[PDB]
Design brief:
The PDB classes it as ribosome. This is part of a larger assembly, with 8 protein chains of 7 kinds. Chain F is mainly α. Chain F is about 25% helix and about 0% strand. Chain F has 6 helices and 2 strands. Chain G is elongated and about 80 Å long. Chain G has helices at about 25-60, 65-75. Helices cover about 70% and strands about 0% of the residues of chain G. Classes of the chains: A alpha+beta, B mainly alpha, C alpha+beta, E alpha+beta, F mainly alpha, G mainly alpha, H alpha+beta. Strand 3 of chain C pairs parallel with strand 4 of chain E. Bound molecules: FE2/S2 (inorganic) cluster, potassium ion (3 copies), magnesium ion and zinc ion (ZN). Zinc ion (ZN) binds near residues 59, 61, 62 and 96 of chain F. Chain E binds one RNA strand through strand 1.
Chain lengths: ~170, ~55, ~300, ~55, ~120, ~190, ~80, ~90
RNA sequence: AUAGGUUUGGUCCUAGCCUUUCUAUUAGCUCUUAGUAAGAUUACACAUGCAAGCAUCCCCGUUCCAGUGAGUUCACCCUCUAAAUCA
């Protein structure tokens, strides 16, 4: 079987289920957490389960983790403007921490839908070209138009070989 | 006047936006000053032949 | 003053919605398509009732009735006539505006004829070109042969009316002549052979009722509803008939007699209903059976 | 990533640009014409037929 | 490929197979190959009459306007297609070519008439 | 051979001979391809009948000359389609040669187009959100002044005979390289009687 | 195609291209059409350039764009 | 192989055996039938009233071969080859 | 991979090799027609012909296209800002 405990974390399906997409202001995220203590259980679960999901959705944001530096766990975000958002995560569960940062620093569902709609316009159905980019390669595929010569030979009158023969 | 199609597309936007008007759209060609083809060009921007002699 | 209700009126929608019915087994019949291993969930009775409710909500979206539209008027508008181009080209040029973010009914599609006339494309050409460049799933550029009279009679012989309606909805536009023609010919076959249950629990029932009421031939549908113990739907059908024909003998009869419930059927049966005798006999049989069960 | 310098490419470039300034042809050489063949002896190119007259 | 100078142009890129031409309207750099790299596809032009006797032309008018507004030039065949569509005025050479054909056909009717009349 | 069912192919599938040979199983139930190895070639033989000569191991369709692949023989065509998913089996599945599989695939599509063979027709959504036909694109555009009067859209479409003075300049500039002057063009395109 | 360095063909050494014969009537009428045609197209081109510039400006510092920017800042605060 | 096959098929738990053990309805969700909830088995005994605890992350052992295929990472020229009806 | 053959007197395990599938070149033998697609082994040497002109002289172009794969993280993103197009 897949190595490690909770191998589900190392699957593309699990990594794409993160709902936290930081705004463009967020640049760095420092996770200070303690390895022992009941009050830091959520922070430990958040580092175990959710940091992979956050990084997957925010590839250009630097996430750095520090162990046992302070008596309590906390998150700190460094924004491009220079503002620092301190989020205390003591006593909170990993689900609560994830929902909290979505509210204060995550893009809403409307902002995301808009970005996806802009991508839809990049592929134009009417454009013809290679299958990697377009639906159809040639107009000959459209029914009613003159088929491709490779499939249906053209009439002798429409072929250049005999066009110049009838004339001369 | 605008060409046939462009005219029809400008009149349709008017009606769609709600503006009710019967004025004809027309292109202002007064700004475009068509100079003759033999008008002296700018010699300062013209190049020069290279040295390769025959 | 007094406008007769349209098909999309909330009142008509509620009446036609209830008349259609909601059979979850028919709405979500297993489709003959590529299959995948089913999934399983351990659910309580409370959770089971919640999923069933969500299926009712999803089923009601699947049953949303298409709007009934009037036949579109042919387009015959000439943008220009450049007589100088006459005789230069032997074939006409069809120019389609493929700007992505434009409603398809707001696109400029024009045709340059060999004579030099720049005219707007006809409704048929417009639909053909939109498919060429914005292909829709289930639509064909060339009219499928299924819609011929001979081919549509085979589909009816097999009781495949709902399939003929889905094929029409995908190929033709709601206001096209071919669209209205097929639905009108399908509704007629259902009436002649009394196959009203085929379209029940589908989004096509409302359109069928609307066609019958506006053509004064709700006799067969009323008989079927009574024979199937659907008085509530039958009374609503007669009620709706009165609203769309207020200046009618049956409408005035109910007004004069203040008929309600089953009385509305009797008043309409004698005055306007063509098969007044058969309706009375059918309604009679039901009322007798109902009296027995009450005991 | 450290590109290896090409010194001869820059040396010749400066020499060429210089020689184009010291050996540049004069208008007397460039725009001379043989009135019998109607060709510029500098390049040996024929003038357009519409300019011969 | 950074070219020396050049400009954007809306022109016809030939596709299809032998004896089956098909043109794609594309905005491409002046110096790029005919069927090579392009900036954006702006439509298509099927020059062969289809079953319905039509030559189909697609024109992304919203994007054609955008590129003409950014300094894109136009090839003669592309200018003649926009003239037939009514987006631009009829290119003068279509008017003159039409007039030349009228004169040729008018001259052809004389010899034909003379033959039938004289002989 | 000459089968008597060519005109009414559906009759063979209801005859006694068919029931004795096949019974209730599909015509291809017993066929087995002869090939080397455990994995068969990914294509079946091209054709079982070459120049009116049948090969050693004819495919299910070619081994029985009374089985006619026709869009009307709906019972035969159904045997070559998946009852649970509706997909046409690829040739290696049943062993039919490429020639007969191509005829079968076309007949199954023709039967489906004629309504003889039932297939899943999905419920599709409407193309347009709004059904209004009031936009100018589909409505009537107000005619332009030139169109109402019958004049050309731009005045320079029509031929205007140039002044005689201007014709003299061109005759001086292009001395010795001049064509016959052309008058106004015909008003309409002539035609060969 | 040939490069500047490639030598000229021997057969083309004596080739002289002769200009076509000019028709006075057709020549003048055609010259005016080009003058009008290019004037109309130049006006159209100018109109398209203005639209492109306006759309860019509207997206950069449009009232709706600035309003959204202010709303985003307020929401953050 | 034979002894292993008969060992697994003999020990497979039926839907009814699952419902009775769990005291909950077994609801089958079929993609071809939309969201229709098909109850395949119900507990013959009393039906529990508490919903089964939904663990956020399942601590289940995944087969790398399964995960690798779902991610389109498994290229094999021998898989999904056309074969005779079995 | 739905796998198969092969170690031994024989069994089980491990393991390599090979078989069956699908393509591309080359060889043998053989070969009827039509349409279409593709097409030196070699950055080895090349006979001959042609491949860039245009145009009232100035300019502009020949810096493109076409070719090859010798060399090889110059190709992508950002910042900044020449030349070029928008008369
Ligand atoms: S690829 Fe379209 S004609 Fe051949
Ligand atoms: K082995
Ligand atoms: K060979
Ligand atoms: K190389
Ligand atoms: Mg500059
Ligand atoms: Zn066969």
């Amino acid at each position: 079987p897949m190595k490690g405990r909770f191998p589900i974390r190392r699957t593309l399906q699990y990594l794409s289920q993160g709902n936290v997409v930081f705004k463009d202001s967020v640049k760095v995220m420092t996770v200070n957490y303690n390895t022992h203590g009941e009050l830091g259980e959520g922070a430990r679960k958040f580092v175990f389960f959710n940091i992979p999901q956050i990084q997957y959705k925010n590839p250009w944001v630097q996430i750095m983790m520090f162990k046992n530096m302070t008596p309590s766990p906390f998150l700190r975000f460094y924004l491009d403007s220079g503002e620092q958002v301190l989020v205390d995560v003591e006593t909170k569960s990993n689900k609560e921490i994830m929902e909290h940062i979505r509210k204060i620093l995550g893009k809403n569902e409307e902002t995301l839908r808009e970005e996806e709609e802009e991508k839809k316009q990049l592929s134009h159905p009417a454009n013809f070209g290679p299958r990697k980019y377009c639906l159809r390669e040639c107009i000959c595929e459209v029914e009613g138009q003159v088929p491709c010569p490779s499939l249906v030979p053209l009439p002798k009158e429409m072929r250049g070989k005999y066009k110049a023969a009838l004339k001369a | 006047p605008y060409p046939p199609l462009l005219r029809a597309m400008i009149i349709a936007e008017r009606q769609k936006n709600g503006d009710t008007s019967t004025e004809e759209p027309m292109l202002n060609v007064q700004r475009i000053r068509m100079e003759p083809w033999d008008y002296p060009a700018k010699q300062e921007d013209k190049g020069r032949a290279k040295g390769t002699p025959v | 003053e007094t406008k007769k209700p349209t098909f999309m009126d909330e009142e008509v929608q509620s009446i036609l919605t209830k008349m259609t019915g909601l059979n979850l087994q028919k709405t979500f019949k297993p489709a003959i398509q590529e299959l995948k291993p089913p999934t399983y969930k351990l659910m309580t009775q409370a959770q089971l009732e919640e999923a069933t409710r969500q299926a009712v909500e999803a089923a009601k979206v699947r049953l949303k009735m298409p709007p009934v539209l009037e036949e579109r008027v042919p387009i015959n508008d000439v943008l220009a006539e450049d007589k100088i181009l006459e005789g230069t080209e032997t074939t006409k040029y069809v120019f389609t505006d493929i700007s992505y973010s434009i409603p398809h009914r707001e696109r400029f599609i024009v045709v340059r004829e060999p004579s030099g006339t720049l005219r707007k494309a006809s409704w048929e050409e417009r639909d053909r070109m939109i498919q060429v460049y914005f292909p829709k799933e289930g639509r064909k550029i060339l009219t499928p042969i299924i819609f011929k009279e001979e081919n549509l009679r085979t589909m009816y012989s097999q009781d495949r009316h709902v399939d003929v309606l889905n094929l029409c909805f995908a190929q033709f536009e709601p206001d096209s002549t071919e669209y209205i023609k097929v639905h009108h010919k399908t509704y007629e076959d259902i009436d002649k052979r009394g196959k009203y249950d085929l379209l029940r629990s589908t989004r096509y029932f409302g359109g069928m009722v609307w066609y019958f009421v506006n053509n004064k031939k709700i006799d067969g549908l009323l008989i079927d509803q009574i024979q199937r113990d659907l008085i509530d739907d039958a009374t609503n059908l007669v009620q709706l008939y009165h609203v769309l024909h207020p200046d009618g003998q049956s409408a005035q009869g109910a007004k004069d007699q203040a008929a309600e419930g089953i009385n509305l059927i009797k008043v309409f049966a004698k005055t306007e209903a063509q098969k007044g005798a058969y309706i009375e006999l059918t309604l009679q049989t039901y009322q007798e059976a109902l009296s027995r069960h009450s005991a | 990533k450290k590109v290896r310098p090409r010194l001869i490419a820059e040396l010749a470039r400066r020499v060429r640009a210089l020689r184009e300034q010291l050996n540049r042809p004069r208008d007397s050489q460039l725009y001379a014409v043989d009135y019998e063949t109607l060709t510029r002896p500098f390049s040996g190119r024929r003038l357009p037929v519409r300019a011969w007259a | 490929k950074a070219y020396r100078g050049g400009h954007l142009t809306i022109r016809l890129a030939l596709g299809g197979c032998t004896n089956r031409p098909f043109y794609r309207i594309v905005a491409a750099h002046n110096k790029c190959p005919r069927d090579g790299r392009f900036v954006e596809q702006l439509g298509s032009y099927d020059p062969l009459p289809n079953s319905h006797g039509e030559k189909l032309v697609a024109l992304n008018l919203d994007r054609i306007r955008h590129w003409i507004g950014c300094g894109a030039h136009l090839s003669k065949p592309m200018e003649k297609l926009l003239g037939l569509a009514g987006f631009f005025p009829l290119h003068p050479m279509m008017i003159t070519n039409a007039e030349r054909l009228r004169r040729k056909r008018a001259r052809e009717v004389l010899l034909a008439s003379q033959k039938t009349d004289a002989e | 051979p000459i089968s008597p069912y060519k005109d009414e192919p559906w009759k063979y599938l209801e005859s006694e001979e068919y029931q004795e040979r096949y019974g209730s199983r599909p015509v291809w139930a017993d066929y087995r391809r002869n090939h080397k190895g455990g994995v068969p070639p990914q294509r079946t033989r091209k054709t079982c009948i070459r120049r009116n000569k049948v090969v050693g191991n004819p495919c299910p369709i070619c081994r029985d000359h009374k089985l006619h692949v026709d869009f009307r023989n709906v019972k035969l065509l159904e045997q070559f389609v998946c009852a649970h998913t509706g997909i046409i089996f690829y040739a290696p599945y049943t062993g039919v040669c490429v020639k007969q599989h191509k005829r079968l695939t076309q007949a199954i599509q023709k039967a489906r187009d004629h309504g003889l063979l039932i297939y899943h027709i999905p419920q599709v959504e409407p193309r347009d959100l709004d059904f209004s036909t009031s936009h100018g694109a589909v409505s009537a555009t107000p005619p332009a002044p030139t169109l109402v009067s019958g004049d050309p859209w731009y005045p320079w479409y029509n031929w205007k005979q140039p002044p005689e003075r201007e014709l003299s300049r061109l005759r001086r500039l292009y001395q010795g390289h001049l064509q016959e002057e052309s008058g106004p063009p015909p008003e309409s395109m002539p035609k060969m009687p | 195609r040939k490069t500047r360095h490639d030598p000229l063909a021997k057969s083309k050494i004596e080739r002289v291209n002769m200009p076509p014969a000019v028709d006075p009537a057709e020549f003048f009428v055609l010259m005016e059409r080009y003058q009008h045609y290019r004037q109309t197209v130049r006006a159209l081109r100018m109109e398209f350039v203005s639209e492109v510039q306006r759309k860019v400006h509207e997206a950069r510092a449009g009232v709706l764009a600035e309003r959204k920017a202010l709303k985003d800042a307020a929401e953050h605060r | 192989l034979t002894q292993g096959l008969f060992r697994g098929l003999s020990r497979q738990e039926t839907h009814q055996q699952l419902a009775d053990k769990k005291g909950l309805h077994v609801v089958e969700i079929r993609e071809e039938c939309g969201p229709l909830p098909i109850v395949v088995a119900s507990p013959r005994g009393p039906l529990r009233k508490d919903p089964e605890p939904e663990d956020e992350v399942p601590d289940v052992k995944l087969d790398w071969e399964d995960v690798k295929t779902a991610q389109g990472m498994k290229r094999s020229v021998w898989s999904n080859l056309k074969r005779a009806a079995t």
